């Protein structure tokens, strides 16, 4: 099962580039797309090496980079341009689709901060559900007239994208000043590319459990509505050190409340005899709170680092606190609704997200059923 990526706007093409650098570094792949001398299945992302990239100004500098051999501002205008090149761009997708053995998903790297890609992102997801109804789509959207373009794409992402990994630049810059002391764009993305790289540690390296993209998502997302995730990455030393440093709100990449499911990926060679002990100490101290209705647990799996390149770890969670972020956005909309052909699509968009904000607040009650 092969995976293919799409990068839109200025943001998606930037972080996706460094995502291609860091991933190409994990394997023994020279910048010139040639294997050097110097186990790891490199066929899911690379096709004989050629990466399955689809890039939609900065592209000129991208080819000017040493990795050349590796291949308006409104929302409606971003949606219009996507319609003007409907068939022209789509041929690239189809020829890459069936030319591949068995497509599994569609990784989408894009921003919703008022860019032409933000609309461009809204269009592709509509058609991706039109043509291929049996193909999962994952999107690593990133959060910041900015209220407008933000709340609109949320209307499409809640019914087309079967998964989503949110990344807000606000909580990122807090990490930038504190533990890197920058006071730039190419500076914060250094850590962002790290999150995505380790996010697919269980895919590029074979393991027992979770050997496919449906193996990770099916456990966390309980319903096609509550389909929002957050990430964590602690190394910036035993197992009880990792999981305890992950649950802190100082590390989460997000600006009652409880968890639904957690996933912790350990990449080190740590002694696996103590992984159950760390699970006991986290329970007894009661450092995290779960749902009361159904039995919700925390899962951990192991894998191995790139031998070419120390204990790392990733935390993936579905927290109902993500509802607060939306409330920050939609509140700005009502304020911009009273201050400034039909303006009816903006109505149903505001309408459908307010159903989602109702769906989260209802999950925290012991009687969420019915």
């Amino acid at each position: 099962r092969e995976i293919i990526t799409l990068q839109l706007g200025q943001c998606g093409n930037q972080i996706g580039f460094e995502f291609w650098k860091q991933l190409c570094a994990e394997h023994g792949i020279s910048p010139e797309a040639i294997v050097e001398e110097f186990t790891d299945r490199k066929d899911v992302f690379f096709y004989q090496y050629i990466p399955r990239a689809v890039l939609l100004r900065v592209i000129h500098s991208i080819l000017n980079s040493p990795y050349a051999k590796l291949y308006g501002n409104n929302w409606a205008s971003g949606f219009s341009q996507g319609e003007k090149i409907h068939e022209d761009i789509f041929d690239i997708i189809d020829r890459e689709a069936d030319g591949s053995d068995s497509l599994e998903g569609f990784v989408l790297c894009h921003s919703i901060a008022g860019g032409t890609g933000s609309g461009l992102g809204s269009y592709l997801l509509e058609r991706l559900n039109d043509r291929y109804p049996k193909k999962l789509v994952q999107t690593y959207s990133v959060f910041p007239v900015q209220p407008y373009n933000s709340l609109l794409t949320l209307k499409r992402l809640t019914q087309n994208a079967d998964c989503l990994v949110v990344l807000d630049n606000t909580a990122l810059n807090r990490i930038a000043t504190d533990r890197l002391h920058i006071q730039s764009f190419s500076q914060i993305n250094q850590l962002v590319s790290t999150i995505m790289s380790a996010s697919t540690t269980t895919l590029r390296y074979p393991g027992y459990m979770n050997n496919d993209l449906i193996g990770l998502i099916a456990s966390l997302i309980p319903t096609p509505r509550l389909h929002f995730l957050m990430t964590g990455y602690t190394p910036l030393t035993t197992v009880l050190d990792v999981m305890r440093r992950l649950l802190q709100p100082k590390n989460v990449m997000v600006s009652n409340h409880c968890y639904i499911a957690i996933l912790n990926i350990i990449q080190g060679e740590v002694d696996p005899t103590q992984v159950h002990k760390s699970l006991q100490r986290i329970r007894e101290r009661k450092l995290a709170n779960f749902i009361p209705w159904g039995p919700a647990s925390i899962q951990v799996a192991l894998s191995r680092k790139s031998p070419y390149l120390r204990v790392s770890g990733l935390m993936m969670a579905n927290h109902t606190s993500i509802s607060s972020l939306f409330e920050r956005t939609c509140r700005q909309y009502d304020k911009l609704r009273k201050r400034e052909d039909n303006f009816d699509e903006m109505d149903t968009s505001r309408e459908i997200v307010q159903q989602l904000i109702d769906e989260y607040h209802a999950a925290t009650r012991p009687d969420y059923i019915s």
């Binding site: 186990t39 299945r41 066929d43 074979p206 393991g207 027992y208 050997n211 496919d212």
Partner: protein, 97 residues
């Protein structure tokens, strides 16, 4: 003698390899293999799926999708059976020696 007997096993006959290889196949540690063997067999479900023309060949189709193996160790995986099923349950008896 004993120290030379045990050493003869590792550095010449790769006893350390056989263990870390049978685990790749029997205990289903290597993904993309069990997720490709079981996925094939489960696509069918009697007289079919029991002759040596399908189950003795589904393995030779499975190892290609393993991306790990195809070595002298990888052979000798006799995907045989030990019972003839007649006809919703959770049982499908089949060995792998």
């Amino acid at each position: 003698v004993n120290k030379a007997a045990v050493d003869y096993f590792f550095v010449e006959l790769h006893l350390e390899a056989h263990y870390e290889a049978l685990r790749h196949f029997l205990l289903m540690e290597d993904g993309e293999f069990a997720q490709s063997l079981s996925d094939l067999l489960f696509e069918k479900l009697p007289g079919e799926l029991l002759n040596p023309l399908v189950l003795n060949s589904v393995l030779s189709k499975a190892l290609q999708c393993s991306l790990h193996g195809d070595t002298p160790h990888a052979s000798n995986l006799s995907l045989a059976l030990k019972y003839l099923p007649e006809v919703p349950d959770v049982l499908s008896c089949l060995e792998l020696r």
